[PDB]
């Protein structure tokens, strides 16, 4: 019922998320930052039934930063994606969920940007752009409509703005704020929170 | 399936810019995982005054809208003048209000340009009857709503409206696994709807 | 509820309790007294108390008018059949439980009506919650052709056993004696339980409670 | 479900009756001025408890039927007559059971004799000489009466005892409470008082 | 649904005074619509200053009332001291919790004295939540009892009346009256009334009869 | 619930126990499990009390008008058919224990029989109810042709006694009926008299 | 899902000991299958055991008891498992296997006369334990227990003869009105002399 | 779901409703009126199961108009209230889906304004103020705290605006626009909707 | 499945039908339900063959080991005890009823009837399987004392055939065994040799 | 109640203006239609560094905060520095997550003034460990949200905050039948917290 989105460009990935945490008719928090800094160049988008989301994200962050610490260098984004997929697939039996829908986004020095998709059944698939949650239905069409394999950063930002204002126009849920960050060779850049 | 699922709804479309209403829909009966047909026209020529729409259930939509056609021609005879869009929506809603909770799965939109001008109403199985400027129903209705909301403009020129309808229907069927087939465009101009064309998504992909 | 009846030498001596139990809470300490309809056909019942009561009223009416048409006193078997057929067709529905007894030209009679319409002519039956204990008392101490006081006693301990050995039963013991000549209002015959003395002396004081609005309406 | 409670105790030619004022949808109060006690005669009242729809239905239907009876016989109804009356109305709708447990408090139109009675939800009167309760908090309310009652109560003490009983009881029930109304029917006049109840 | 674990009724009632602690209960053991017996006390003596009451699934009543004594004995062997009231309360809360997901279908009341000898009553729920209280009635008739106790002792809805501290005699009279009254409207209660009184001079227990039905 | 009937030359012999159960408790231990439908036509309702008793009584109602109309003794086959359709129509809600046995002027003695649900058999002997399952072997090994009334009685008593010993849902005393030219001979073997085929 | 059950066990205290009884009957549902099995057993020279409900579980109880009893006799100190101890031990077993949802589909009766004092104990499916002057299980509780308490109310203490007569009269009633009851039954009795289970007795037709 | 609210002043009743209908996640009409015109001085607020609400509301519409034309005079708000209560309670036992929760508001020349709360159980109840829908949960407290039995139209509108702002702050659904009308001695008065 | 065994003077006589069902189908019609447990101990299975014959093999294994270690042929009561425990539902998914009977020097023939669930009771004769219900009465009527081998065999065959006719789970031929001190005598009864009985 | 009579709590609230956080909760315990007690301390006092709330299950919350108090004191004795609010919240979250979906009905919310400031974290049964500023939990917490939102201001004053909390919970219990009794209030200032007051609801009604 939440909303994620990622867009892959020539040398950057722009991702965005909602900041609403609700358990009932009422939302309890309007600043929920649900994006986990995997490393200096990798972000993890986590959504699903809450409680397990935070724990699985912390486990992955733990062990990835552990890898980087034990090994000098840092994991390639493909490695992180496959690692998370394996964890989720293997654990799909015993602890009956982790029930988390993921979007792993990252950019490395020489293999370029990347963006990986995960449902709670742990199905990994690279894609130029994707989304999650009920809102994704109203959005993937727009992403198809105004996306090209090459897109300037500002054009990607305004496309995202178009998508989010469409969400507010048409979706039934209330999403008055939207975190957004961008990944390139210069680490990870916070961006202007999209508010109304 | 013991013979009764008939649909679950695939990617309708309708809006009412200042040169009448245009409607659009695809053609892909989804018998569970297997396509029943690629050439199921979903726009229904109720009369040269008013257009229906098939969605949610094939047989129920077709039957009840044909019955509506009977009823409205009876009306036009008795009153000697054409029935209004709102009245037709009322008739359909009252007809379908009974048999509530018996498995009906209608998702029609009544479209026409009556004396009040453009007429567009959403009539469904469970009794919703609402007018509006923008509509689409079916599985791909969400994608349709996306593209439509980003294309719509009451002052949009006619040909660009055609382009909007084609783009919306194409994107929706491109994402949906359950919507497909050839796109149909019907323009309800001044008195008497006019068929636009029936183009194919495969060719559209080349055009796009 | 625990009701029982026997056919002694010259009549029937019905027995019943007066503990109405709405759920596991005593509805009435002196439950609406279980004896019923027009003379020489008194019956007592149990189960869904409401329907027992209103069925008895219905049959009472329908049979009283019958008797008035006849000019002759009604017969037990008549009420028996009526209760049969009404506690019938509403089968799979509420129904009730009944002990029907009376003394007509054919002497005493005693049938035990059941919800679906199961009936049977017996010298002794017990119905209700403590029917099991009451039947035990009977089968222990019943011998045919008891005397009036003997039958009254027998039913007294029959009901008492149900009173002291059941959860849904126990109050004033009620006796209902119908004979070819006589009829008794033993209401109630004997009470084993007395409310303990209230050692508290609360004597609710005036002005105990604040009052917001005091509206008075003289009538006379 | 909606909740509430009613009660009536007899006395020395004086009967008391009371019911709460909370109207809440199964968790949440809607208002504190809901009507549960209704006048059926000069000196005859009925108090309802249960589904608010059945409360306001049985009350109106009883108004109907009793008014018809009054106009027919031309005489104010006997309390026992009303008791049997309502004993029927619930019963015709046997397999539609009106989810309510009415109570009756009244006096003799010829002698002003004390009288109370209650009904099961399909009609099975408990013609009691002391008290009846109904609604959700029946057990607490029984508990209060079972001690607080006393024989031959003069009207002021009767009012004080009913006040104390209901205020002790409904305070202990979650879904009922929030205001208590009280009526005292004596041989001549009627007093209706409202009580400082915990409004929580 | 409804468990295979029969309900045994009973009623427990306890008031803490200034130096005493009333613990009293009906002694009737019942299931369904039949009484097992008439001389089953539901109050058990633990220390010279603490007395437990337990009611509910009578099997669990027994298991608890005889598992606790083991804890007391071993705590005495390990600490050279008879545990105080609060110790009993915390112990009972934990041991009740220990069977969280298959709980003891029991309601339990602790009556006793504190360090200063003031009255103390601790009331529990089946899982183990507990809180210190001046008085509480627990069990089948708890609904019929507790509000009357609230009125009489806590002076709720009492206005313009002094708060007379509870004397031993008044407390005993009140308990006897409330139990004889509860025997009227609750069916599970009857056949006797056992009362345990905890005083600094030890424990003396009294019994009276109720409606034998 | 061990009704059984035997046909012999010129008459029939019936037999059933006296125990109506409510599960594991006996409501009545002297139940008159033999219903005389007419002067010389009996039956044995079994399977549940009310649905069988009422149907049997209704069949007595019918066929009485029908015999007065024809002004001839009722034919056994006629009773069988009537009490067949009367069951068959309501075969979806009723239980039943029809083993109709009786004598007629024309065709000697008959034992028509059918469990609940309706159908027709005119067999030599009929067994129905609980204990029939247990008594099948004994009856099959013992029944012969042409046995007269006295050994029919002894055979019936023995079979019912075996059922009595092995069944737990049937018991009490053994009621018997010997229908023949002159009339019915209802007797009640109980206690010592019932066959004692000891266990060893 | 108890396979084969017994009907009931009756037992009443008396001056000098405790007398209990039960009937030989093995029921596979409404089928009366086994008609000579003993459902009461002599624990030791001071204690018996009565059993209702399932029988196989009763045989397993006989196994474990007859092992522990001998285990005690071998020690040869003089101490014996008093009936109170046996009752207490049955309760804990009933828990130890009910606590893990695998109960013993039984209702157990202990009757003992230790140190000049009688003792009667009830144990059931769920480990509900207590002591009472007169006990009855199953439909026995609904039928004979009322009569026993009725008579015991007026007379506090019974001699052996009168208590035994009470026993056979209640057993006659139970045979009359209980479906799962047999015509024949033992009666057991403990005194200072010893446990003396006696007779394939029967409710001679009356 | 939806949300309705009524506030009664010393001499007027003020109503407000949200203007969005849903199918699953979408808001087909953003300009939807859920509030009907019973007669010259009586307004009806309806909500509940789709389909039933409009049918029952217009049934009452035809009834009350027929009453007015049969009699010439005007039906009192209390009378129409009881009439709706009966027409709703009777259908309870023979119409399984008939969910309509109502707030019937109006003015009477004699007894001033009168607002009626109406659960779909057809349990009519007078109220100085009331509300239906989920948002009533979050809002009835605010409506309680800042209410006085006497409130001029200005404070009433401001309190209502406070209520709506609280919804937009906390409620998880998206309700951007609300229709507001007030009933007084001079018929009903349309008030500008509350846009954000 | 109509296993039934009888003790005679000097040994026991077994007997069982030969039919295995899988619904309305006859899986096997020559099923040999007698199982050699030892040199002079057999058993008879009933229902859920797999969960029986596995028990049979396991118990015969344990008996063989016990016999070779004690150095004397096993007592019948011994083999009576190795079913009783593992049929006391140590597996409890063992719907199975086995009547074991053989011969020992110590107490001659013995017959035990370990039922469903785990009991272990000795009887002079025993019956098992589905068809038992149809012959309980017959065997209670016919069995006596002091029967010899010939008449015991005729008894066994008669009872088995009587079960054979009625129960749908009894078909094919009749198997028999005559355990005695001298030896074993297996025999199979087929065709005309099954005792017939005159039909109605 | 075959084996289930769990006590519970409802209508807790808190907010964290400049002078530190305030805990205010009611004390009505209901067991169906039956209020079991009146003054159950729905503010669990873990230690004079932290405070905790109780809702959903009284026994569950009681024990789990008890055990966290054990863990926290252990942390103090080992590290000899006070634990952080974040550390406590995360520890409880891990401790409760295991036993996932086992029937835990915890709805607590931790508060305290640690060395980085005054903090407030929500911890529920299903692992929601969310920071925040203005929180309230329980069946009648919706009204608390309403009023508190209308009263909250990060620059609010001490007596102003006291009246805010009191009035808010009073409205809440006035609307919720499952919330009542006397309200308890707790103030968490700079390290070491004080108890403001705990007064009865009827007194509050007379005040208003």
UniProtKB/Swiss-Prot annotation, chains A, H:
Membrane-spanning intervals of the chain: none
Places the protein is found: Cytoplasm; Nucleus
GO biological process: proteasome-mediated ubiquitin-dependent protein catabolic process
Family to which this protein belongs: Belongs to the peptidase T1B family.
Complex formation: The 26S proteasome consists of a 20S proteasome core and two 19S regulatory subunits. The 20S proteasome core is a barrel-shaped complex made of 28 subunits that are arranged in four stacked rings. The two outer rings are each formed by seven alpha subunits, and the two inner rings are formed by seven beta subunits. The proteolytic activity is exerted by three beta-subunits PSMB5, PSMB6 and PSMB7. (Microbial infection) Interacts with HIV-1 protein Tat.
InterPro entries for the chain: Ntn_hydrolases_N, Proteasome_beta2, Proteasome_bsu_CS, Proteasome_sua/b, Proteasome_suB-type
Domain of life: Eukaryota
Induction text: Up-regulated in ovarian cancer cell lines.
Name used for this protein in its record: Proteasome subunit beta type-2
GO cellular component annotations of the record: cytoplasm; cytosol; extracellular exosome; membrane; nucleoplasm; nucleus; proteasome complex; proteasome core complex
Modified residues (N-acetylmethionine): 1
Keywords: Acetylation, Cytoplasm, Host-virus interaction, Nucleus, Proteasome
Annotated PANTHER family: METALLOPROTEASE TLDD (PTHR32194), PROTEASOME SUBUNIT BETA TYPE-1 (PTHR32194:SF2)
Gene3D superfamilies assigned to the protein according to its UniProt record, in alphabetical order: Glutamine Phosphoribosylpyrophosphate, subunit 1, domain 1
Swiss-Prot record, chain C:
Catalytic activity: Cleavage of peptide bonds with very broad specificity
UniProt keywords, alphabetically: Cytoplasm, Host-virus interaction, Hydrolase, Nucleus, Protease, Proteasome, Threonine protease, Zymogen
Main location: cytoplasm
Gene Ontology molecular function: endopeptidase activity; threonine-type endopeptidase activity
Gene Ontology CC terms, in alphabetical order: cilium; cytoplasm; cytosol; extracellular region; ficolin-1-rich granule lumen; nuclear body; nucleoplasm; nucleus
Superkingdom field: Eukaryota
Enzyme class, UniProt record, top EC level: hydrolase
Tissue expression summary: Expressed at a low level in colonic mucosa. Up-regulated in colorectal cancer tissues.
Active site: 1
Entry's localization field: Cytoplasm; Nucleus
EC numbers: 3.4.25.1
An annotated GO BP: proteasome-mediated ubiquitin-dependent protein catabolic process
Similarity-based family: Belongs to the peptidase T1B family.
Role of this protein: Component of the 20S core proteasome complex involved in the proteolytic degradation of most intracellular proteins. This complex plays numerous essential roles within the cell by associating with different regulatory particles. Associated with two 19S regulatory particles, forms the 26S proteasome and thus participates in the ATP-dependent degradation of ubiquitinated proteins.
Protein name stated in the entry: Proteasome subunit beta type-7
Lineage summary: Eukaryota, Metazoa, Chordata, Craniata, Vertebrata
From Swiss-Prot, chain E:
Keyword Nucleus: yes
Localization per Swiss-Prot or TrEMBL: Cytoplasm; Nucleus
Lineage: superkingdom: Eukaryota
Function: Non-catalytic component of the 20S core proteasome complex involved in the proteolytic degradation of most intracellular proteins. This complex plays numerous essential roles within the cell by associating with different regulatory particles. Associated with two 19S regulatory particles, forms the 26S proteasome and thus participates in the ATP-dependent degradation of ubiquitinated proteins.
Name of the protein this chain belongs to: Proteasome subunit beta type-1
Classification via InterPro entries: Ntn_hydrolases_N (IPR029055), Proteasome_bsu_CS (IPR016050), Proteasome_sua/b (IPR001353), Proteasome_suB-type (IPR023333)
Disease: Neurodevelopmental disorder with microcephaly, hypotonia, and absent language: An autosomal recessive disorder characterized by microcephaly, intellectual disability with absent speech, severe developmental delay, short stature, and hypotonia. Affected individuals also manifest aggressive behavior and have hearing loss.
Glycan-carrying positions: 30, 181
Keywords: Acetylation, Cytoplasm, Deafness, Glycoprotein, Host-virus interaction, Intellectual disability, Nucleus, Phosphoprotein, Proteasome
Keyword Iron tagged: no
Modified residues (N6-acetyllysine): 176
PANTHER family for this protein: METALLOPROTEASE TLDD, PROTEASOME SUBUNIT BETA TYPE-1
Phosphoserine modification, residue list: 34, 40, 134
Pfam families given in the database record: Proteasome
GO CC terms: cytoplasm; cytosol; extracellular exosome; extracellular region; ficolin-1-rich granule lumen; nucleoplasm; nucleus; proteasome complex
From Swiss-Prot, chains F, I:
Modified residues annotated as Phosphothreonine in this record: 35
Enzyme Commission number, as recorded: 3.4.25.1
GO BP of this protein: proteasome-mediated ubiquitin-dependent protein catabolic process
GO molecular function, one term: cadherin binding
Induction comment from the UniProt entry of this chain: Down-regulated by IFNG/IFN-gamma (at protein level). Up-regulated in anaplastic thyroid cancer cell lines.
Keywords: Acetylation, Cytoplasm, Host-virus interaction, Hydrolase, Nucleus, Phosphoprotein, Protease, Proteasome, Threonine protease, Zymogen
Role according to the record: Component of the 20S core proteasome complex involved in the proteolytic degradation of most intracellular proteins. This complex plays numerous essential roles within the cell by associating with different regulatory particles. Associated with two 19S regulatory particles, forms the 26S proteasome and thus participates in the ATP-dependent degradation of ubiquitinated proteins.
Name under which the protein is recorded: Proteasome subunit beta type-6
Gene name of the record: PSMB6
